[PDB]
Symmetry: C4
Subunit: 442 residues, 4 copies
């Protein structure tokens, strides 16, 4: 039928955050008891439904660390050298429990400049010393306590060098090391084989961060999860190869129109080369686009086109979809594949987040709410946000998350939701007019 | 059918006050002749459809007194010691006609400090004196006129002490006492049995407040009605027990989500222990929630979630229902039980109140409109309002009520409503756009 | 069916001026050629569809005169003494051609104070003199030209007194008198019978106002049309009796709720006593109300409740109907009776007027647009408007009318309407959103 | 059926730019590869879908030149003398390649004042000299290089006069002349027949403007396209006759209500006299109006009534149609005739343009966006805009076009549109609320 596309032009209708409210429901569950955890895949498991945007004013290593510590996930932005980005990922992966199975080491023949680089780069504060690279046999350890008395860093590890050291067998756990470090009063516990060949290193920091950040989102090895953004370019594979060597949990293929053919192609290509890699692809606003990314191999779909708070797409190109309808239409399609969606853009308040999750999104992604947080890249106080603009300095990330998560639990309480799955599946909205929205804020 | 909850997510629609207008109708009744009285139960009968909110910036004894005097009802807030709240209720119950059947008394052996406490506490200004507590036989009365000549309050009632006194038999009425007090020129008329044992006390104040506040809402004994708020906590029963000893007319079980299981439980528990007690339960926005509270034993339902003028629920949790739809959906369910609903929150103008009552609510409850009234707890002039904020100092309660009630009678006139029942049942609305609302205010 | 009133409560929907636009149509007729005349009854025929409101800040004699001169109609407001209002009507009726069939006269025995009163009261500037009241035989005429030379007004008409005078037979017309006054160079032309008994008077002013205001709306005798407001009170009949003696064309029974029984009663009563009188009754917003007023005998219906620019009805009582829907629903009912409606309130711009007339109204009524006009009661420049408020000083009425009528002709041009009947009957609207209205103004 | 027009009065609904967004679609085509060209007729072919409005604050010769150079089209406004307007058209037609087939020439007997007039008028900078008008035989050429050494312009061409000159045969092309002018180092290349009779002239400017403005919209002869506005008046034919002599590509019959009979008549009359002329007729908002203009002979239809940014039509006459619905309803009708429509008025941003083109318009017309551009008629910096108002000074036209066209290509990218035909035909919208529009801008 020739005329259908023409006749249907104005037919569709969509809703944004301010058009609706969640409707209260029978609830046996209190806000404090609800579970806010979400699984994006078996290798990607968040304790809070939050991701910081890959954007140069939002997410670099310090941020990805702070996010993961809270149960969420950072995405390292791509506006940096590939070597730089892989390095940013490595810094997040090795922040805690990173040298347990893959330790750095020095030899007596290195300078102390080498020690200070490693401790500085990874924030570890102790370094193992082996006889030689080939042998892998550990002789001595140089640490932060040792650095204090060293005036010149040009001198070799031999000079400022032992005694017997307390070392433990490989596959020693944190709770095991906790007692050893405690019994013997050490802050560093190297791990060797039966031959005394260096295998790994455990520090008290690997211990106390576990205590201090119990909701941390971590891989199986116990290291902080991290994502990274990759464009669709000739550069794409090379960059991914380097990040994968990095061990970063997920790659986000971030483009403006995710329903283009060039993007489907690249997904197909990356899935082929990395069958187990977490591939987050976006951005899409439709069910058809969502279906195409999933059949291309995306294991997560990122959603929204136009809704961003700095996004000029609507005004300049006339293009976009109201975010809740976007999330809803996408989630409707992704649901049939057991595929999670991310809600990307448009979220001003904690209530918006709750609505995004109740319209079907597994996680939400925030740029601007995080832009003035202490841990973000930038330096009353002020900090920049670009895609150009400004937002107040918000203090440490943790305070913003707490109010977000607190809003989420209250909302879950009103809806009677023990967990996010229940919410996505059971929550009902009610549409309201502009005048309906005027009371909502008071 | 597995998919119904998902498909229906965005289906519902709701209206607030500004979306609608009452439509004029055939009217034989003038605003001055209409009846604004409402019955919440046989033991709770208002002459005006207004309740002051249990809130620490709105309602304590002075307020509950002023409300009841106007035909409405105060709810003592729960942000106080239980002993304190029971005492606040007692002050309202004994404001007028309170010692008629349950008198306080002293003995010649008390000090005058005791007299000044009682007169001060209850604003009565005369105190009966009996020989002894066991005997109950009245000897003398100490009053405000007597206090003037007393310099030291440490002295006993014996010293500043009689002559024969004019006393009347129990079950003497106000209109009877009016003539006696008038014939003999006394302001105090104690009541004894045939043995001269003290039974009660009547004062001219019990008389002239009847004259001065003819619309007063009162129990069968003729004392001002009062409510009290109770949370859902381990504290709940103990607090209620004390208030019931107080004789307060109604308890309001006030929680944020009234459709939770913990709230239904507590209602069931209180109804069991107090089969005749007025239990106002809330807050709910749905018919299902309304049904559950009624079957739990609530004899009044309080409505609205999100609409409050300080309420951040909408923004922080994303949760709420547009107030008129809320009231309408609740009233639709409660109607089948012969159960009244209260409209709680969102009312800015007298016209909003009229609309709330025409959408099915029996009474409305107001926090903010009363927050700067003289009788409210706080101290140009200024007074605080929190759930933090401010509202102009409005003068005495009576002036705000008069314009509210005047708006209500005009509205009833336009709709042709002789009484509130007719209004609830017959009144029709018309929906308008935002531009429709722009003319409405001019 | 018991439940219908409850279920239908929120069903109705309504539109105001800003929700819609008139849709352009095939047009063979230019704005200058269209006819803006309207017939409210055979005795009430306007050359422009405009009425000035009976309101103390809008319409008194000066205004009713200015309106009628433009083809419209003034309504003298009722906030004045009945004698005062009848006098205001008489001033409008006698402004031009008023003493042609019912002349005032003096006798030689009156003082000149009497002459100056009459000329001053009615702005006529000549007065006939008869021998005696019984006889009616005219002797001399005293005029403005004569007053100049008179220092003391206490002196009798005898003193400052003749010669033969040029007089004409009764039923002399204006065009006849035009030539006589011209041929003989007189400004005053008395009219007598064959016996020389005074019958009427014609002046050059009666002539030149016809020239100067060709669109004037006039009765059969050629005097300016005038209306008057009457309340529903015990006062009503007495006031009407006096106005009818006045000869005022129409009475407006103006009340807040025209669908009340007391108003239907009064209409029935006035129609009975004055079978030919023009009775404008209001105000109503519904078809049912409209039907009741017509069957009570109203020959015009006035419409709108809430739309007034000073009207607080919406906010205070919650009551009203969006004006276009009001006019449309009323016009739909009145049409079946051949009955015209007036659109009363809400009109900010000339475009609103065009829309009001295209929604079915015969005429529109304006308070606020006329409030600062020179001819209005009040005294940069400033003038008050109450029902309290302010509006810029607009200059003479004629300038405001011209832009109104110019807007009306343009609108009629776009719709292809040769006359108002075509417009009412054929014009189509298109509904738009708030954003649709944002472009409309630029 | 008598009552249909009355019942349907409020039935229609319409949308403007801010009510909607284009929905992203499968896209294989990048913004840089899309084609923005449009054909209004075989003789009217634009490289960009833009027309500058015939308005005295927007388009005169300088503007029509700048527009055409960019691939768009200027319409010379009619608020000028007919001789003046024909002259403005001639200036645009002869800006480049204009004297190739119809050269101006002088004789040795003219003064230099004549030379300076021609070079000044047409910006050509060389003038051919023939022996005599009858003969047409070229003797010498006077140019800009020659003017430098001439102090007095009163002297004849004979004085300041040869040598042999390098001339080429008629039908020489630009690419041919490019090499000649290059090989011989000349900037002027006259064209003669075998007899040495002057036929045309080619300059280096005719060459380098081709290089400098590759997207230029030109006729078959290679001269810049130009339009002109004509009113509907007695003046109409005479004016058109003169413009056609001008060779201007299109005439725009511009009136306020294009659905009037006088406008259909004039179209019929002009089509009869000029069967091949491009006739752009407007303005219309309906399909019925659109059909009537096409059957009258309009080969392009211009659309919108009310949407203009200075247009008071909505407010003053109450008349208009929301622009997208207007364009859509018109395009729906015009499509059946293979007829293009122009979207005229209402466009604030590049996104609005994209939406106008996706609602079915072939081209859009802009007044206000171009009003402060350097090339516009008027003289921080400031420039006026009237239909009275102001708009910032925008710099040269080219910068505004580039952002417009860049917005258009992005939008086309999101929709997957290789060309404008695909866009018109396949693009889908989604309607949003006012709150939906609040996020769109951030
Ligand atoms: O097309 C775009 N051009 C941009 O310059 C831009 N900047 C941010 N974004 C998107 O907006 C998201 C952040 O949204 P919020 O600021 O509301 O947190 C981000 O996560 C992005 O998806 C952009 N999209
Ligand atoms: O969830 C809530 N958190 C709060 O801090 C709060 N404060 C007031 N209220 C509710 O609002 C009602 C008063 O509404 P108005 O101010 O519009 O009179 C009150 O009667 C309450 O029902 C609250 N609800
Ligand atoms: O209920 C009312 N109380 C008032 O104090 C009042 N003042 C004006 N009006 C009505 O408004 C009309 C004038 O409307 P505009 O100001 O918009 O011209 C008038 O013609 C009246 O119908 C009132 N209605
Ligand atoms: O009825 C009208 N009276 C006017 O004074 C007027 N001025 C501009 N226009 C129209 O508006 C168009 C320009 O629209 P924009 O300013 O939004 O670019 C123009 O192209 C015109 O179609 C007018 N229409």
């Amino acid at each position: 039928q020739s005329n259908a596309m023409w006749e249907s032009k104005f037919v569709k209708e969509g809703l944004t955050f301010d058009d609706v409210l969640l409707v209260p429901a029978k609830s046996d569950v209190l806000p404090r008891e609800v579970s806010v955890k979400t699984v994006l895949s078996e290798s990607l498991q968040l304790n809070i439904p939050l991701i910081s945007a890959g954007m140069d004013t939002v997410t670099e290593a310090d941020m990805a660390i702070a996010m993961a510590r809270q149960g969420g996930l950072g995405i390292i932005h791509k506006n940096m050298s590939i070597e730089q980005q892989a390095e940013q990922v490595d810094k997040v992966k090795r922040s805690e429990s990173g040298v347990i199975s893959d330790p750095f080491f020095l030899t007596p023949e290195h300078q102390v400049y080498d020690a200070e680089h490693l401790m500085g780069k990874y924030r570890i504060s102790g370094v193992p010393v082996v006889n030689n690279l080939d042998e892998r046999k550990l002789v001595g350890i140089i640490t932060n306590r040792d650095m204090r008395f060293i005036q010149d860093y040009s001198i070799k590890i031999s000079d400022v060098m032992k005694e017997q050291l307390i070392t433990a067998p490989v596959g020693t756990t944190l709770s095991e090391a906790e007692k050893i470090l405690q019994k013997y009063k050490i802050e560093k516990l190297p791990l060797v084989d039966n031959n005394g060949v260096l295998q790994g290193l455990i520090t008290i920091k690997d211990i106390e961060k576990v205590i201090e950040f119990p909701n941390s989102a971590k891989d199986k090895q116990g290291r902080l999860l991290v994502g990274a953004a990759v464009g669709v370019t000739a550069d794409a594979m090379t960059r991914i190869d380097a990040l994968v060597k990095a061990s970063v949990d997920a790659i986000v293929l971030d483009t403006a129109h995710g329903h283009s053919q060039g993007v489907i192609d690249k997904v197909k290509e990356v899935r082929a080369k990395y069958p187990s890699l977490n591939i987050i692809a976006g951005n899409v606003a439709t069910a058809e686009a969502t279906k195409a990314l999933i059949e291309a191999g995306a294991n997560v779909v990122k959603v929204g086109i136009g809704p961003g708070s700095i996004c000029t797409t609507r005004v300049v190109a006339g293009v976009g979809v109201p975010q809740l309808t976007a999330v809803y239409d996408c989630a409707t399609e992704a649901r049939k594949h057991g595929i999670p969606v991310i809600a990307d853009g448009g979220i001003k308040y904690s209530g918006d987040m709750v609505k995004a999750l109740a319209a079907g999104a597994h996680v939400v992604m925030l740029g601007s709410m995080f832009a003035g947080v202490a841990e973000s890249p930038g330096e009353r106080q002020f900090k920049v946000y670009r895609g150009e603009g400004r937002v107040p300095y918000k203090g440490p990330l943790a305070d913003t998350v707490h109010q977000l998560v607190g809003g989420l639990r209250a909302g879950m309480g009103y809806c009677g939701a023990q967990d996010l799955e229940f919410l996505r599946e059971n929550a009902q909205f009610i549409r309201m007019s502009g005048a309906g929205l005027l009371e909502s804020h008071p």
